[PDB]
Amino acid sequence: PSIKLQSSDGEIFEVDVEIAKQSVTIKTMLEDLGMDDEGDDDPVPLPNVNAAILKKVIQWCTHHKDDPPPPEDDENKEKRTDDIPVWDQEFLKVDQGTLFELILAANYLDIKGLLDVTCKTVANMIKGKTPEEIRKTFNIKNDFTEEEEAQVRKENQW
Amino acid sequence: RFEVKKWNAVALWAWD
Amino acid sequence: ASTLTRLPIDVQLYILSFLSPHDLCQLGSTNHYWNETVRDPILWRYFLLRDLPSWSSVDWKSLPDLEILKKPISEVTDGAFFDYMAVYRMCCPY
Amino acid sequence: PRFAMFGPGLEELNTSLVLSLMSSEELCPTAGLPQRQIDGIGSGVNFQLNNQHKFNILILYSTTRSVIPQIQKVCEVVDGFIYVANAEAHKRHEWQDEFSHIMAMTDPAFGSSGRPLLVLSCISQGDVKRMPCFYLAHELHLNLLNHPWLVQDTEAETLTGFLNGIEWILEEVES
Amino acid sequence: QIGLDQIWDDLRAGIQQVYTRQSMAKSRYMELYTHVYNYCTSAQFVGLELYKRLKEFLKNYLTNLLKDGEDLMDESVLKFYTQQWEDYRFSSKVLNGICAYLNRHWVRRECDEGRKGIYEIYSLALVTWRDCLFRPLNKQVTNAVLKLIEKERNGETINTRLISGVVQSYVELGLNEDDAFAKGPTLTVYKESFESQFLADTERFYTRESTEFLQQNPVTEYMKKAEARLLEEQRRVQVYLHESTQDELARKCEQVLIEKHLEIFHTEFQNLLDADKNEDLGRMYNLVSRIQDGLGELKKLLETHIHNQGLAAIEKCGEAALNDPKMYVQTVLDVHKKYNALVMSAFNNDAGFVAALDKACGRFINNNAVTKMAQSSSKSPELLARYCDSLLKKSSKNPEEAELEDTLNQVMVVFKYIEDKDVFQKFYAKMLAKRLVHQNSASDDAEASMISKLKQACGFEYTSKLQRMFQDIGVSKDLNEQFKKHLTNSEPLDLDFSIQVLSSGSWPFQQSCTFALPSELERSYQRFTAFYASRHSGRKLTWLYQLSKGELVTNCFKNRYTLQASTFQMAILLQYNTEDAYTVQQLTDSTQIKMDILAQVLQILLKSKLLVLEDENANVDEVELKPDTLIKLYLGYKNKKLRVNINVPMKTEQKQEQETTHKNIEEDRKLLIQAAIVRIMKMRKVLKHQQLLGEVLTQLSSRFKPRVPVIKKCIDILIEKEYLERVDGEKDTYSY
């Protein structure tokens, strides 16, 4: 069995249901809605995801089908950003704009693995850099004058 | 006359 | 009005949950919106719980002031501390 | 100057703490001097840490009671105080008797009130489970102490923390 | 980034489309999810304004629903409730999916912040169900479900889907508000609002049903109906109730259906046991055993009945059991076997019931009607002893070995309850001796198996005497083989000599009077003395002639008669061969036999009619033979057979032997208790008299149970034997 999909552009990304089970939104939708032969071929609109990035999350879900869920508690887990699978490392070799679109689409589709790896990658892109480096990277101009910039140095003190 | 041909008996072995 | 600022605040804190406390202060040291959005008690309370047994020294001048009211208090509606990073800045090995 | 080292944790711990104290080459050990030996107590002798710090300590064995007359007179002219404490996390521990003993040996009538009390919460070896120092210090309620103190997690065999605790009270020599 | 005013109208329309079951399309559901997401991703966290509307809408919707099911009939509302509940649950689940985003962005934030009174959206729908619809309608719906359970118990079947839905809803409404992370089936409201009412209704209904059934039906049909009710109640809990009711309802039904009538159960039990209804006793035990420690007194009742039956069993045997052991042992064993069959099938071989059976069996074996007739308990094992002798005597009938082993096993089972085991040991030893010295035994493997069973029952020293009896008879057989080999090698004798050498200590025997050995018999006796002097000079022999038979030729008559008799009879016949006229005094001075046994052997000779008195007209069977009374051999007598047996017991010497055995076991009892108290008092040295006799009873209870006059006599014997000293004044405490 397979489920119709529909982005905010107007195209269809027909994918297998077990591929789409990674979204617990979609998993719940297929779980308790009264599944039957009536109203099954209608595409489902997703008016918060772009078409190309929806294709990207479809490709990610196809690649992340075979891995069983490792249900574990994160409070005893060491939060490390260097444990990313390498497939995601060549997958996320793309610019920051569509990566943030990917983060928002993952949060919309609550893809646990994809959201986790995107958060790990942006944590890698934030870790070990001067505040000027992040300021240049994501172009947020400092609204406060030089005295706040002076006092935050002694505030953080590494 | 009387003649003997078979007579079984019991004897008590006692340690001295 | 940046793209990272426009991100939903739930995943924004989820991103910061993976940041090391050494690196997290410099991100919040950029002032603007990021100086106050990193001052969330919920994130630092998780930081305090996962890093308290790791440390091995407490002093008199930076003793964990009312720590039983911070970490062993578990949940409390009086979450108006807003300075668990200051608690962490006091509880850090420095 | 002098440094009165006391605490019932000397006999509480399975590992002999004084054995590794007198067997560390950089710590400059010294045998017990009968001149500096108290009556029925240990002999506090010179232990020149890192062969650079000029200071003497006064070792006292595990003694419990008000302070006995053998320890109140010795505690008078001392730069600070040293107490040894349990650090294993096994069961409930005494937080009131130890606090009363701390208040007894840190009485303001025994000299200056600014004399610190270095508390060495120690475990046997590195493989032994240890109570967190943050949890233990607040359980001991050291906020009410109102004079300087330090709780350092240390190991008796590897001397990882012994130098750190002693280095702090050496900074309090001028104060 | 759209405010709640624009979102909320469309969101409310979609949510109302969800709740009113019209099978809403997938596109609308994803559009509602998009609406909630775009609202939440517009203070620091904005979900309170959305949560309040969801809380108020659910409150408003349920109040509008409550008016529809306000005061309809009890059978109706339940169905209504179930239907509504089902739809509500499904609707809430779909609603949850939308506020699935509200289940992560904001509700988790509020739970982390510690602000209680907040819930996940599905749990919010459940909680507002617990406070707007379940609370006011709860009494009516639980009264309705109790009424419908009562209807189903009365016999009319009903749709169990309704009850299962109500119970599932009651289970699901139990939520841990403070800690929603604490998972597991919480049954707080299910126990607080249903379990108490249901248990009370079950108590009332089974009270009424049980009282009516006892007042209108016999007890056994009530047992049947009560077992059916308990099984049906397990079915009811299994099918359309919760799992946790299974223990509590079973306990309550056992307490109200069987326990509160348990007394009248006893009123039937013995009566039921009077009818020997094995299946009904099985049902009785099966129902009673569900009550802990309720069988106990009931158990004892069984014991008493068995004892009574046992006594009646002996009353069926009558006076004949005192002299015919077969019927007595068969009666006792039949009663034991019948009650063992009843306790091994109806009572499931319960350990307490088996113990009660064993206690009762001991109580009517050691003391019953025949023991009262013989005024002693020692008759109880002795008869049993005689019984096994009747199963080892080589008779004309040849019993099969397998069934013989089976019935000896049954005899051992009966003997297991004998108190006076030493009496049985001595009687069996004496009967085994009488069997072996006359080689009149049955198949030898049966004897060996019986000895092995006795050994397994009572240790080694119990039958060490019998084992050495067998080894002695084997040694005697080998000695006879050696004697016949030597006499074939040496000069031949005149008779077939088949001596059975016997042990002086193990075998219970008494030496008779002296004897005048015949010259031709002395010629072989001297050869045997030389034989045993050559073989083993370290042994001595007594040669009692009370039990020594043999056939002698009969030339001074019509023809050769090879009749066999006792040694005294052979001596008398040889004396008459020398001279065919002898007086009683002449026989006394010739044979050197004391008066009593000589009179007995002479009167049994006259009973055998081999020879006649001096006067034919004189009495024979009722004459007291004076020493001067002359007897002449009756040469005119004719024997019907060439080999005639005369060695038959006399009743007088039979009774004399029995009372001699009783005296011997009495003195053995005295010696054993003397040695036992000697061995015990050296261990303690301070123990007082009543404690000493109690300890003696405990240690030798496996052998017998002595009477207290015998205990006092043994105490006196050991006092004036000076082995231990008594304490003056306080005669209880002793010392060594």
mmCIF file of N, CA and C in Angstrom, chain E residues 145-216:
data_model
loop_
_atom_site.group_PDB
_atom_site.id
_atom_site.type_symbol
_atom_site.label_atom_id
_atom_site.label_comp_id
_atom_site.label_asym_id
_atom_site.label_seq_id
_atom_site.Cartn_x
_atom_site.Cartn_y
_atom_site.Cartn_z
ATOM 1 N N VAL E 145 -25.593 -0.804 34.860
ATOM 2 C CA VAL E 145 -24.753 -1.958 34.553
ATOM 3 C C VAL E 145 -24.869 -3.015 35.643
ATOM 4 N N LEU E 146 -25.080 -2.608 36.900
ATOM 5 C CA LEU E 146 -25.332 -3.599 37.939
ATOM 6 C C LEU E 146 -26.667 -4.298 37.720
ATOM 7 N N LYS E 147 -27.686 -3.552 37.285
ATOM 8 C CA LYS E 147 -28.968 -4.167 36.961
ATOM 9 C C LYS E 147 -28.830 -5.151 35.807
ATOM 10 N N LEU E 148 -28.019 -4.807 34.807
ATOM 11 C CA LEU E 148 -27.877 -5.687 33.654
ATOM 12 C C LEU E 148 -27.039 -6.915 33.993
ATOM 13 N N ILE E 149 -26.050 -6.762 34.877
ATOM 14 C CA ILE E 149 -25.301 -7.916 35.364
ATOM 15 C C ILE E 149 -26.209 -8.829 36.178
ATOM 16 N N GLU E 150 -27.105 -8.243 36.975
ATOM 17 C CA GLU E 150 -28.090 -9.038 37.701
ATOM 18 C C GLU E 150 -29.008 -9.786 36.743
ATOM 19 N N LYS E 151 -29.427 -9.123 35.663
ATOM 20 C CA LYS E 151 -30.252 -9.778 34.653
ATOM 21 C C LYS E 151 -29.508 -10.934 33.996
ATOM 22 N N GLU E 152 -28.224 -10.739 33.695
ATOM 23 C CA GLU E 152 -27.441 -11.801 33.073
ATOM 24 C C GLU E 152 -27.202 -12.954 34.040
ATOM 25 N N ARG E 153 -27.068 -12.654 35.334
ATOM 26 C CA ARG E 153 -26.911 -13.707 36.330
ATOM 27 C C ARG E 153 -28.202 -14.488 36.522
ATOM 28 N N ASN E 154 -29.351 -13.824 36.381
ATOM 29 C CA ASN E 154 -30.628 -14.512 36.519
ATOM 30 C C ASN E 154 -30.874 -15.514 35.399
ATOM 31 N N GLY E 155 -30.235 -15.341 34.244
ATOM 32 C CA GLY E 155 -30.360 -16.306 33.169
ATOM 33 C C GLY E 155 -30.488 -15.708 31.783
ATOM 34 N N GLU E 156 -31.077 -14.521 31.681
ATOM 35 C CA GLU E 156 -31.288 -13.897 30.380
ATOM 36 C C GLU E 156 -29.975 -13.338 29.851
ATOM 37 N N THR E 157 -29.554 -13.812 28.683
ATOM 38 C CA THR E 157 -28.345 -13.293 28.064
ATOM 39 C C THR E 157 -28.576 -11.876 27.551
ATOM 40 N N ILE E 158 -27.481 -11.130 27.408
ATOM 41 C CA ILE E 158 -27.537 -9.743 26.962
ATOM 42 C C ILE E 158 -26.225 -9.422 26.259
ATOM 43 N N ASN E 159 -26.240 -8.351 25.468
ATOM 44 C CA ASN E 159 -25.075 -7.947 24.690
ATOM 45 C C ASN E 159 -23.956 -7.513 25.628
ATOM 46 N N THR E 160 -22.907 -8.330 25.713
ATOM 47 C CA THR E 160 -21.776 -8.039 26.581
ATOM 48 C C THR E 160 -20.900 -6.912 26.059
ATOM 49 N N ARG E 161 -21.103 -6.476 24.814
ATOM 50 C CA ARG E 161 -20.328 -5.362 24.279
ATOM 51 C C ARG E 161 -20.581 -4.091 25.078
ATOM 52 N N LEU E 162 -21.821 -3.894 25.527
ATOM 53 C CA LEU E 162 -22.153 -2.724 26.331
ATOM 54 C C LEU E 162 -21.373 -2.717 27.641
ATOM 55 N N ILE E 163 -21.345 -3.859 28.332
ATOM 56 C CA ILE E 163 -20.642 -3.939 29.607
ATOM 57 C C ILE E 163 -19.144 -3.789 29.398
ATOM 58 N N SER E 164 -18.611 -4.409 28.344
ATOM 59 C CA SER E 164 -17.184 -4.295 28.070
ATOM 60 C C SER E 164 -16.801 -2.857 27.753
ATOM 61 N N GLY E 165 -17.655 -2.143 27.018
ATOM 62 C CA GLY E 165 -17.391 -0.740 26.748
ATOM 63 C C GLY E 165 -17.429 0.116 27.999
ATOM 64 N N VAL E 166 -18.409 -0.127 28.877
ATOM 65 C CA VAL E 166 -18.487 0.632 30.123
ATOM 66 C C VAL E 166 -17.253 0.383 30.983
ATOM 67 N N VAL E 167 -16.836 -0.878 31.107
ATOM 68 C CA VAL E 167 -15.688 -1.197 31.950
ATOM 69 C C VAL E 167 -14.398 -0.655 31.341
ATOM 70 N N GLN E 168 -14.271 -0.708 30.012
ATOM 71 C CA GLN E 168 -13.095 -0.139 29.361
ATOM 72 C C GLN E 168 -13.029 1.369 29.558
ATOM 73 N N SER E 169 -14.174 2.048 29.465
ATOM 74 C CA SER E 169 -14.201 3.478 29.742
ATOM 75 C C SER E 169 -13.821 3.764 31.188
ATOM 76 N N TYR E 170 -14.334 2.967 32.124
ATOM 77 C CA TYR E 170 -14.005 3.177 33.529
ATOM 78 C C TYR E 170 -12.518 2.980 33.785
ATOM 79 N N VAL E 171 -11.905 2.012 33.105
ATOM 80 C CA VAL E 171 -10.464 1.823 33.222
ATOM 81 C C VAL E 171 -9.723 3.027 32.657
ATOM 82 N N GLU E 172 -10.155 3.517 31.492
ATOM 83 C CA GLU E 172 -9.394 4.557 30.805
ATOM 84 C C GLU E 172 -9.536 5.922 31.472
ATOM 85 N N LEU E 173 -10.653 6.180 32.156
ATOM 86 C CA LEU E 173 -10.803 7.446 32.873
ATOM 87 C C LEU E 173 -9.895 7.574 34.087
ATOM 88 N N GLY E 174 -9.249 6.501 34.525
ATOM 89 C CA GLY E 174 -8.291 6.628 35.602
ATOM 90 C C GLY E 174 -6.974 7.182 35.103
ATOM 91 N N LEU E 175 -6.685 8.441 35.416
ATOM 92 C CA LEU E 175 -5.471 9.095 34.950
ATOM 93 C C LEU E 175 -4.705 9.662 36.132
ATOM 94 N N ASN E 176 -3.384 9.511 36.102
ATOM 95 C CA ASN E 176 -2.508 10.120 37.100
ATOM 96 C C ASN E 176 -2.215 11.541 36.640
ATOM 97 N N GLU E 177 -2.989 12.491 37.169
ATOM 98 C CA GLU E 177 -2.887 13.878 36.725
ATOM 99 C C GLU E 177 -1.532 14.480 37.070
ATOM 100 N N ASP E 178 -1.023 14.193 38.270
ATOM 101 C CA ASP E 178 0.227 14.800 38.715
ATOM 102 C C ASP E 178 1.418 14.280 37.918
ATOM 103 N N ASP E 179 1.429 12.986 37.605
ATOM 104 C CA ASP E 179 2.524 12.355 36.869
ATOM 105 C C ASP E 179 1.921 11.573 35.706
ATOM 106 N N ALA E 180 1.718 12.256 34.577
ATOM 107 C CA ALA E 180 1.239 11.580 33.378
ATOM 108 C C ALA E 180 2.301 10.679 32.766
ATOM 109 N N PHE E 181 3.573 10.886 33.115
ATOM 110 C CA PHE E 181 4.631 10.008 32.632
ATOM 111 C C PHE E 181 4.535 8.621 33.254
ATOM 112 N N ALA E 182 3.939 8.516 34.439
ATOM 113 C CA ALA E 182 3.761 7.230 35.109
ATOM 114 C C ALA E 182 2.722 6.423 34.341
ATOM 115 N N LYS E 183 3.189 5.455 33.561
ATOM 116 C CA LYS E 183 2.326 4.677 32.688
ATOM 117 C C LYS E 183 1.713 3.510 33.462
ATOM 118 N N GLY E 184 1.104 2.576 32.738
ATOM 119 C CA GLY E 184 0.463 1.434 33.344
ATOM 120 C C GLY E 184 -1.026 1.649 33.508
ATOM 121 N N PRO E 185 -1.790 0.558 33.576
ATOM 122 C CA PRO E 185 -3.243 0.691 33.737
ATOM 123 C C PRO E 185 -3.621 1.157 35.132
ATOM 124 N N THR E 186 -4.025 2.417 35.255
ATOM 125 C CA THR E 186 -4.452 2.968 36.531
ATOM 126 C C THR E 186 -5.939 2.709 36.722
ATOM 127 N N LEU E 187 -6.289 2.106 37.856
ATOM 128 C CA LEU E 187 -7.651 1.669 38.128
ATOM 129 C C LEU E 187 -8.234 2.386 39.338
ATOM 130 N N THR E 188 -7.858 3.649 39.539
ATOM 131 C CA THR E 188 -8.344 4.384 40.702
ATOM 132 C C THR E 188 -9.842 4.640 40.610
ATOM 133 N N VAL E 189 -10.308 5.173 39.480
ATOM 134 C CA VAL E 189 -11.732 5.458 39.358
ATOM 135 C C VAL E 189 -12.525 4.182 39.101
ATOM 136 N N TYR E 190 -11.911 3.180 38.467
ATOM 137 C CA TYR E 190 -12.589 1.906 38.260
ATOM 138 C C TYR E 190 -12.868 1.212 39.584
ATOM 139 N N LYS E 191 -11.919 1.271 40.518
ATOM 140 C CA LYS E 191 -12.151 0.708 41.840
ATOM 141 C C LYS E 191 -13.038 1.600 42.693
ATOM 142 N N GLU E 192 -12.920 2.919 42.543
ATOM 143 C CA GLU E 192 -13.656 3.831 43.408
ATOM 144 C C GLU E 192 -15.128 3.933 43.032
ATOM 145 N N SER E 193 -15.477 3.710 41.764
ATOM 146 C CA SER E 193 -16.843 3.924 41.311
ATOM 147 C C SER E 193 -17.554 2.678 40.812
ATOM 148 N N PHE E 194 -16.836 1.612 40.473
ATOM 149 C CA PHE E 194 -17.464 0.395 39.973
ATOM 150 C C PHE E 194 -17.195 -0.814 40.850
ATOM 151 N N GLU E 195 -15.938 -1.030 41.246
ATOM 152 C CA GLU E 195 -15.567 -2.268 41.925
ATOM 153 C C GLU E 195 -16.291 -2.413 43.254
ATOM 154 N N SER E 196 -16.423 -1.317 44.004
ATOM 155 C CA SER E 196 -17.145 -1.372 45.270
ATOM 156 C C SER E 196 -18.617 -1.698 45.051
ATOM 157 N N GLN E 197 -19.262 -0.987 44.124
ATOM 158 C CA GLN E 197 -20.674 -1.228 43.848
ATOM 159 C C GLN E 197 -20.898 -2.631 43.303
ATOM 160 N N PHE E 198 -20.046 -3.067 42.376
ATOM 161 C CA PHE E 198 -20.199 -4.392 41.787
ATOM 162 C C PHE E 198 -19.980 -5.484 42.822
ATOM 163 N N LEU E 199 -18.970 -5.325 43.675
ATOM 164 C CA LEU E 199 -18.718 -6.319 44.707
ATOM 165 C C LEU E 199 -19.866 -6.379 45.703
ATOM 166 N N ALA E 200 -20.410 -5.222 46.093
ATOM 167 C CA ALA E 200 -21.539 -5.213 47.020
ATOM 168 C C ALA E 200 -22.770 -5.863 46.402
ATOM 169 N N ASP E 201 -23.028 -5.583 45.123
ATOM 170 C CA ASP E 201 -24.159 -6.205 44.444
ATOM 171 C C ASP E 201 -23.981 -7.713 44.339
ATOM 172 N N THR E 202 -22.756 -8.167 44.064
ATOM 173 C CA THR E 202 -22.492 -9.602 44.007
ATOM 174 C C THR E 202 -22.693 -10.251 45.372
ATOM 175 N N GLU E 203 -22.233 -9.586 46.439
ATOM 176 C CA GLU E 203 -22.480 -10.072 47.795
ATOM 177 C C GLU E 203 -23.967 -10.245 48.051
ATOM 178 N N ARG E 204 -24.754 -9.215 47.737
ATOM 179 C CA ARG E 204 -26.187 -9.268 48.007
ATOM 180 C C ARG E 204 -26.868 -10.357 47.184
ATOM 181 N N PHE E 205 -26.561 -10.414 45.885
ATOM 182 C CA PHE E 205 -27.246 -11.354 45.010
ATOM 183 C C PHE E 205 -26.894 -12.794 45.353
ATOM 184 N N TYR E 206 -25.621 -13.085 45.633
ATOM 185 C CA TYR E 206 -25.288 -14.456 45.996
ATOM 186 C C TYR E 206 -25.772 -14.815 47.390
ATOM 187 N N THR E 207 -25.868 -13.848 48.306
ATOM 188 C CA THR E 207 -26.512 -14.128 49.584
ATOM 189 C C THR E 207 -27.953 -14.568 49.374
ATOM 190 N N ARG E 208 -28.704 -13.796 48.585
ATOM 191 C CA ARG E 208 -30.104 -14.123 48.333
ATOM 192 C C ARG E 208 -30.241 -15.469 47.629
ATOM 193 N N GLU E 209 -29.438 -15.690 46.585
ATOM 194 C CA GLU E 209 -29.534 -16.922 45.812
ATOM 195 C C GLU E 209 -29.155 -18.137 46.648
ATOM 196 N N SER E 210 -28.095 -18.031 47.454
ATOM 197 C CA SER E 210 -27.670 -19.162 48.267
ATOM 198 C C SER E 210 -28.688 -19.485 49.351
ATOM 199 N N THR E 211 -29.231 -18.466 50.028
ATOM 200 C CA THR E 211 -30.244 -18.743 51.044
ATOM 201 C C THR E 211 -31.483 -19.380 50.432
ATOM 202 N N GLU E 212 -31.941 -18.870 49.284
ATOM 203 C CA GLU E 212 -33.113 -19.461 48.644
ATOM 204 C C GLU E 212 -32.838 -20.889 48.187
ATOM 205 N N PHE E 213 -31.635 -21.154 47.672
ATOM 206 C CA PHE E 213 -31.334 -22.494 47.186
ATOM 207 C C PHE E 213 -31.214 -23.493 48.329
ATOM 208 N N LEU E 214 -30.614 -23.091 49.453
ATOM 209 C CA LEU E 214 -30.601 -23.978 50.614
ATOM 210 C C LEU E 214 -32.004 -24.209 51.156
ATOM 211 N N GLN E 215 -32.848 -23.177 51.163
ATOM 212 C CA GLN E 215 -34.200 -23.376 51.665
ATOM 213 C C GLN E 215 -35.097 -24.129 50.691
ATOM 214 N N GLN E 216 -34.693 -24.285 49.427
ATOM 215 C CA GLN E 216 -35.557 -24.921 48.441
ATOM 216 C C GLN E 216 -34.904 -26.075 47.686
#
